[PDB]
Amino acid sequence: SFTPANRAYPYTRLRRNRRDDFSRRLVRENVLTVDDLILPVFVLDGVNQRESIPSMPGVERLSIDQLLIEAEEWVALGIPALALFPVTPVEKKSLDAAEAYNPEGIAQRATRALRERFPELGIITDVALDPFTTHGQDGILDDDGYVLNDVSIDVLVRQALSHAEAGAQVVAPSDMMDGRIGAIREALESAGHTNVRVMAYSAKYASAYYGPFRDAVGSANKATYQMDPANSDEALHEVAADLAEGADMVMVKPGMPYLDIVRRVKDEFRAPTFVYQVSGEYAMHMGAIQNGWLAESVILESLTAFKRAGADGILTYFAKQAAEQLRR
Amino acid sequence: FTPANRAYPYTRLRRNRRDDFSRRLVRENVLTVDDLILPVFVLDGVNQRESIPSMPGVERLSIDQLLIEAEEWVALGIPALALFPVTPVEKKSLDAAEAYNPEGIAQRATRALRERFPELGIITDVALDPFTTHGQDGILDDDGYVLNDVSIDVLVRQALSHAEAGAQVVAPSDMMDGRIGAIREALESAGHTNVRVMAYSAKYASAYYGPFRDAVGSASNLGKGNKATYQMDPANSDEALHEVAADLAEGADMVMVKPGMPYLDIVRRVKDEFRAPTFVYQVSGEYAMHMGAIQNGWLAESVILESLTAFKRAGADGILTYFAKQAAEQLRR
Amino acid sequence: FTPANRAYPYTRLRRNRRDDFSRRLVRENVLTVDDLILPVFVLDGVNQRESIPSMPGVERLSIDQLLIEAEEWVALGIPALALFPVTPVEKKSLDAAEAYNPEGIAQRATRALRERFPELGIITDVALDPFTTHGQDGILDDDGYVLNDVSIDVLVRQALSHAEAGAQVVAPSDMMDGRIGAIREALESAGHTNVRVMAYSAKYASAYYGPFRDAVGSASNLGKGNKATYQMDPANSDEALHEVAADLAEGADMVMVKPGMPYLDIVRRVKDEFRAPTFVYQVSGEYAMHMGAIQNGWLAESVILESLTAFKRAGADGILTYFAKQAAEQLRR
Amino acid sequence: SFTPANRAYPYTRLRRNRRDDFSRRLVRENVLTVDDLILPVFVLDGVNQRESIPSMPGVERLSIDQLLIEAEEWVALGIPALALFPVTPVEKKSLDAAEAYNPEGIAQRATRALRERFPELGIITDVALDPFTTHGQDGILDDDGYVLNDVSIDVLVRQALSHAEAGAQVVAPSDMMDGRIGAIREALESAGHTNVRVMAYSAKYASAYYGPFRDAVGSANKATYQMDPANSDEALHEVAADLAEGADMVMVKPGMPYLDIVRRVKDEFRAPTFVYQVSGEYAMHMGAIQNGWLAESVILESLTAFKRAGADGILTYFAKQAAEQLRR
Amino acid sequence: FTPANRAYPYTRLRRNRRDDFSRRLVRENVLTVDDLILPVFVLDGVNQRESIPSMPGVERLSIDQLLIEAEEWVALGIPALALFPVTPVEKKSLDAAEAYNPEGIAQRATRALRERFPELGIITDVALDPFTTHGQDGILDDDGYVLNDVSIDVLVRQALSHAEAGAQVVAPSDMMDGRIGAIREALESAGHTNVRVMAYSAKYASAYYGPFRDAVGSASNLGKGNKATYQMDPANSDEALHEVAADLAEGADMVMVKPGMPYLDIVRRVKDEFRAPTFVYQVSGEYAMHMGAIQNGWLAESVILESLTAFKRAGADGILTYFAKQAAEQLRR
Amino acid sequence: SFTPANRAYPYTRLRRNRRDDFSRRLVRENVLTVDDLILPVFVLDGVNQRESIPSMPGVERLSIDQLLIEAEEWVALGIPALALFPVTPVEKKSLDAAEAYNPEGIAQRATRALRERFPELGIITDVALDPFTTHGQDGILDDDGYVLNDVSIDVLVRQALSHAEAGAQVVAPSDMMDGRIGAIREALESAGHTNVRVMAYSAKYASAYYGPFRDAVGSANKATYQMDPANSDEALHEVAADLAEGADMVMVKPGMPYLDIVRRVKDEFRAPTFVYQVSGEYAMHMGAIQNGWLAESVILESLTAFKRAGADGILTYFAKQAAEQLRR
Numbered sequence A, D, F: 001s002f003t004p005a006n007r008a009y010p011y012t013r014l015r016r017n018r019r020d021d022f023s024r025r026l027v028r029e030n031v032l033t034v035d036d037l038i039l040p041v042f043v044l045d046g047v048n049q050r051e052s053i054p055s056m057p058g059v060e061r062l063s064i065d066q067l068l069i070e071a072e073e074w075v076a077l078g079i080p081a082l083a084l085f086p087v088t089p090v091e092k093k094s095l096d097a098a099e100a101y102n103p104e105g106i107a108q109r110a111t112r113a114l115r116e117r118f119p120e121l122g123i124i125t126d127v128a129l130d131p132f133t134t135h136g137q138d139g140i141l142d143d144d145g146y147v148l149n150d151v152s153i154d155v156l157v158r159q160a161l162s163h164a165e166a167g168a169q170v171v172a173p174s175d176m177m178d179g180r181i182g183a184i185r186e187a188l189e190s191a192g193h194t195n196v197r198v199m200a201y202s203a204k205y206a207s208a209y210y211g212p213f214r215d216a217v218g219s220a221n222k223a224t225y226q227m228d229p230a231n232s233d234e235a236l237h238e239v240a241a242d243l244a245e246g247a248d249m250v251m252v253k254p255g256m257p258y259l260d261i262v263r264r265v266k267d268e269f270r271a272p273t274f275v276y277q278v279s280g281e282y283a284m285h286m287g288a289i290q291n292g293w294l295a296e297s298v299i300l301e302s303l304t305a306f307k308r309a310g311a312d313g314i315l316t317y318f319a320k321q322a323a324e325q326l327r328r
Numbered sequence B, C, E: 001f002t003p004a005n006r007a008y009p010y011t012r013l014r015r016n017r018r019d020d021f022s023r024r025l026v027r028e029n030v031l032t033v034d035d036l037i038l039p040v041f042v043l044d045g046v047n048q049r050e051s052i053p054s055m056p057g058v059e060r061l062s063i064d065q066l067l068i069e070a071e072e073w074v075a076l077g078i079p080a081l082a083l084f085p086v087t088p089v090e091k092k093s094l095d096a097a098e099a100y101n102p103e104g105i106a107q108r109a110t111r112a113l114r115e116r117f118p119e120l121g122i123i124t125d126v127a128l129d130p131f132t133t134h135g136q137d138g139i140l141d142d143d144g145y146v147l148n149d150v151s152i153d154v155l156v157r158q159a160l161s162h163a164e165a166g167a168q169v170v171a172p173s174d175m176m177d178g179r180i181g182a183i184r185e186a187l188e189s190a191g192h193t194n195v196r197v198m199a200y201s202a203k204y205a206s207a208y209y210g211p212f213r214d215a216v217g218s219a220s221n222l223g224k225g226n227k228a229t230y231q232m233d234p235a236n237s238d239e240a241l242h243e244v245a246a247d248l249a250e251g252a253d254m255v256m257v258k259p260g261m262p263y264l265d266i267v268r269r270v271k272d273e274f275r276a277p278t279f280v281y282q283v284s285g286e287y288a289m290h291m292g293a294i295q296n297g298w299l300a301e302s303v304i305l306e307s308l309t310a311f312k313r314a315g316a317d318g319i320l321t322y323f324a325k326q327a328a329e330q331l332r333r
């Protein structure tokens, strides 16, 4: 609620608290810390390998050995968690997305390796069929090319179970099938994975901002499962279902173009609330900074926005650069 | 909000997403051309057009060229322009006198447009930053601090001069405390009964204004200077409601949040709490980052309408956007 | 709040508690050094340091010693000090004239600090209790009652003298009705445009101020006297909202609850209803009880940060705390 | 909600009602009475025994015969209920916490004795494994030393049933296992203990304020079941679950450092709401009073705080001293 | 309110009802003697006591007898009396001049009580109905309508006279628009800084005042007259919030609902919306109906405390009740 | 919600609308009509019989033939419903309350008679064991004299079914057993009584105002099932359960001493909300009117109070007198 309390110029001058650095610090409503940051990482199949991504300047795909080397620095910076995104070899893609639950799939191998080397580092796996399907569709298709809901869930459940077996502390379904959070929850509980967190992509929109991601993972209609950008009330129904179904955290994706959604979600549910600053937001920002059009300070500014809007944690490709700025 | 015990599989939220016709029926918000305001950079002189490297596709234009281009903006149905003059270097001063010159660029441009296109809205910029040698939004004391009340005296003269030139809307972008009331009191006194005041109510001390400062040429004046003693801390949300409340008490006809996309949560809170006409500026840095990504082939041209739909969804009534023409074109077609 | 039908075993709230990394991600509030204000007891004279038996570890300091100690407070990043002068006995009077002496301890200390540490916030104490022979916060009528409006006249002189000495913030701790408005009107008139007024809005007639009254030396003056005709009844919560509402209407830049931990529910209500910068005093008695338990080995040193985290969680923007240095040290390390 | 109603100085002078004792009494919002008070008591195994506790000055551990003697005075003062805390002999501690449900365990014996002698006195037993485990962990441990949730619940249920058999009118689970209120409720109902109250420790924090208690009971990580002190929204989810699960009362612990939590709980749920002024709060206050740093009046002041914040009842080591002050 | 999915048999609300100790723990409200105000009918003369047939057990008393009885009211801890004078017939007039007579019964009684019992609260009645020949609460125009502003002029004189006699609280029971502000402005001007104003804010045009009109002797004056042009329509609830809002804006220290039990829903709305000190009058008709039933053996004496507990539960801070002594006796024992 | 809208004297003068009868009528917020009225009636076992009740002046007990004669007038006045209260012969009272479900019990006979003669008249039967138990206890007793919850429900269900069989359109459980609304609902549905309304006595208080009723029915502790008069929040939990359990209407009893409860119930649930102006409220009012202490107008005034507080219907012994005043 809001009560203006009859405040009026000149008795009230809001510039007074702005006058000095010390008073600005005292009244500052929100601060970003490294504990708000999650780093998404693109993981290759090989050894001794890194690759640059044309539409995501400065982001590398890394083989698992290279991932372990870089995680030393991420852990030193205090980054609490990584979000793993495998770059599936084309030979391993299929109509049935079976690679999703392969015990020696990239995500499963990367998870085992990280859990052993850095036991305190959070590993959030991606529960999703798009990296494993022949054309990059987000699930199993019917004769009309429609992504079947419940049949896709069956595969997502096997995948989530395989991640839990590999040691993942958090599984993060990014698929937008109806009811999948509940299905995954019933399977994790039945299997005795009682502490495995489910970070639901609850209000994920049918967005043009995912363009560069598809270059990153090598996966390059969605309006039949991802949300219409026009819709806000609908996001509340999505999150309400996911919390009833057992999610430990709920996410809004994309991020900055949906800050109003972050605010409403946090205000209405008062649950742990996450947001993804996606590949397109990263690319636009990094592009402008590299062109000398925007100052490097826009990085923190965009991240501060998430905190102010109500987010508990941010999946961001800027995580390491932000961590280094926060530290010094 | 009441969830009403809705539960899978009785409730499957993909059912409404199944077909175009049903997505359309349930669609919560739609952008139209009546939501669009085009900011324009206005040069002195005749037959002048200048590219802006940090705003690819945007041109500074002399008044003659402005009048020509406005034919298609009007044909597109764009309801209003926000004018931003590019002050010649020699007209910048300590006292910012050029702000209220009846022969200033902003004043000349307003008279020309009001005569040529009587139905087109003209929103003038009330601000001293285009006219100061230091590039700060007001008059400095001997410590280099921007004096609040003394700066308002100049802003008042400026707003009065815009009303005299025929501007239907004056928009104070300065972030002085109390200037909405001061300007409103001056307009009323002078008989400018229906001149609208579009307050920049919750304008943040942001890094996203870089390309604009290049465009109007205040970048070299400002140098490394900042506006943290008047523009708002990016961290602060509750404070925005206090800013808006005062501007409404002071007589604003419209209230605005700036920047736009990095502050959509502020747009939402402001529309929810006050239920007043609420405006948002998609600023130069926002424009530049989208255009850069599009020209690189990193983002599809559809992001333009996606970014604008967000403002509508968040609660905005109108959007100042350098994409206005491209958007109106795409909405028309 | 909507529970969203969450139910065991689908919802197990221990899952987020399982690992340090996930506890960290979901952590709702974190104390930083920018939340801390250090109250300091200031003696007259030179090279003076005095222990306080009821506040183990806290020293009264002369200005010279204050300036030395402040080097490490600034190095620690502590944003502000709240100054509390220890008035010599012979300077106490019926009329509390010493309150506005330009050569009073508070005034001398402010000038010295503002010159030495220009970025350090100085919050002065607007109050007559250090200066009266009876120890009450104002001027007595012939029934021994603290006169409201006549006391304000003195508080106004005092606040003006602090502004003249350079104090960025004046903090009226007196609990006279209407004094925020009176002081604000005086500051504005005199041109002190940006001097902040941190109102002690909801200050309770509490027993937890004992050690402070010892520290500043008002204990012997007050004797068995009480402040129930001005400070608030501990029983009353709704009344705090009326106190805050008035202080905001009167121009306060910040509003404060005192004491702190025994009144966390008041902090919560005040931040929830007004959404204004909200401050809380962890008072001398609170300090003393924690330090006593720690020195006895009854409570671990971690209670310090636990007690301060509570203020943040409850809604406080800033905390006046005698633990500021120990806390800043522990946050730094 | 709040409406300021345009009240303004000098028309409004809030000191007017403060002018006189009579008007202060008329407008006084909250009062503490003895019916708000619950006395926690430390119960020894022997006969003819009392012991002092170094970190809780003035508090005695008492054998059951001594407990019955002292309860005469507590009953005379009108104290409605005791909260029993057994001091387990070290020979009776085990990995399996079996002493928790022993029909002749201290708590069970004390309960039978009190129920017979003072039939109108409320007896609130502590449902908890920490007094009965070899090292004082709050439940049954896995190989990694993690407190297993559901397996601990099994023992807590047997304990709660044994308390109900002994005659306890209220059982009070202080363990912070997920779902235990529901488990205890299903067992009490199945067993025909239909009027046995469950007072849930709903929002119990991982606190440094419990130090002296561990000296009192002879039990001297918790962040994996007790709440992070930083978290407020989370307390609402905890209480919502406990009410759905069948709790008759909900509690916040510790007390004064969490008054904001008391306020939110009472405001949101409007259910019987309890608060524990824990051993550390008692010790700090009593210490300062004994040192001559704080006046005895801080006792009432701290207790009045609970009432004002929304608490229906307070577990306090000051109960008897407060009862004597309230009476005269 | 959130039901939190509570469901039989997991939730059995009789469990807390099972034992006295648990009912006590969960008990939401408890009446104490500090909630009680005793209205008293005061006669002229010496050694006068008169029974009231319609208020069985209540006596009109001369000042001397009042002073004697007050010894036990004070011993019982009753915080305040509300004085109601029984004006001699010959002192009633068109102009209600007796209202402000310094030697009126109300004024004499106040002086006597303030001297004898300095800690006892005295609430005087600001109203013209005891003093008019027609029995209406003010001055009539030539159509027989009660003039609003002209009546306030008299009420102001009356309130001033009560403040002069030493009354700590004046209570305007007249229901003129704006009289709270008028009286407050007069008190402030004259230096009566701390005289409380207990507004009868939402006082209904009720039939339950019959026995009171007999008690003070205004019944024969009023005859068949009604007060529907000033007292509120019994049908109206929303209107009460507008009445209260104005009285608070005008400076009331306490707001009151009258009658009491037939208007408990109004007590609840008023306390919920404003969170101010809220008072309720258990009127003469309410007293009479309870006492009649008790004396008939139709209702047990326990209804007295039940009826008073209701006011507390509904949100009242204090209750004017002719049962004050019987209640204080029963609470004491 | 409430917004004062800065209204201020003298621009705002609330007496303006009060100036004239016409403007008072236009702005009048609530009106009582006969459709708000329910008449409770005391029904005797015999023929050709009426009896006066000492503590309820002007109220008669009536045999069924006399009830049918009087109902002609009640129906002519437009009174929508009667609430039947049998006066059980002492020979028919028992420990097991079997008379409660007797097909030829007074309530069942009265119901059949009225349903046949006046098919449009609402008949609300009382579901309750107190008229049928040996000493007037509100249910079946254990060895300690405690009213057993679930075992009493079994009898209440058989009674409710017998009322439904007799033709009653509404059954009204006045017992305050936990969960009885649900039990009665499951039985009515199973038995095919799908349109039988259940009017729950949801927030019924342990009150002294029931004194004269006990004289009326010949039935002359309750704190273990009826609510503590001190408790308001608790009434919300009571009504929430009864609506979840299937009640078509919810009631607050007693009436005028609980108008705040009526207001909260209607505000929070927005469901059909009833209130009982009980025998003690009737007696106090009628007593004062007969003594010449209060004018007859207090009857309407008290009834108007119910409407204003949020009640949809009022059980009142004044129903006929009020109906005649409303008509003319």
Ligand SMILES: [Mg+2]
Pocket (backbone or CB within 6 Å): A176, A177, A178, A179, A202, A238, A241, A242, B013
């Ligand atoms: Mg979904």
Ligand SMILES: [Mg+2]
Pocket (backbone or CB within 6 Å): A014, B175, B176, B177, B178, B201, B243, B246, B247
């Ligand atoms: Mg502003």
Ligand SMILES: [Mg+2]
Pocket (backbone or CB within 6 Å): C175, C176, C177, C178, C201, C243, C246, C247, D014
């Ligand atoms: Mg104040």
Ligand SMILES: [Mg+2]
Pocket (backbone or CB within 6 Å): C013, D176, D177, D178, D179, D202, D238, D241, D242
């Ligand atoms: Mg729990």
Ligand SMILES: [Mg+2]
Pocket (backbone or CB within 6 Å): E175, E176, E177, E178, E201, E243, E246, E247, F014
């Ligand atoms: Mg009025």
Ligand SMILES: [Mg+2]
Pocket (backbone or CB within 6 Å): E013, F176, F177, F178, F179, F202, F238, F241, F242
């Ligand atoms: Mg019930």
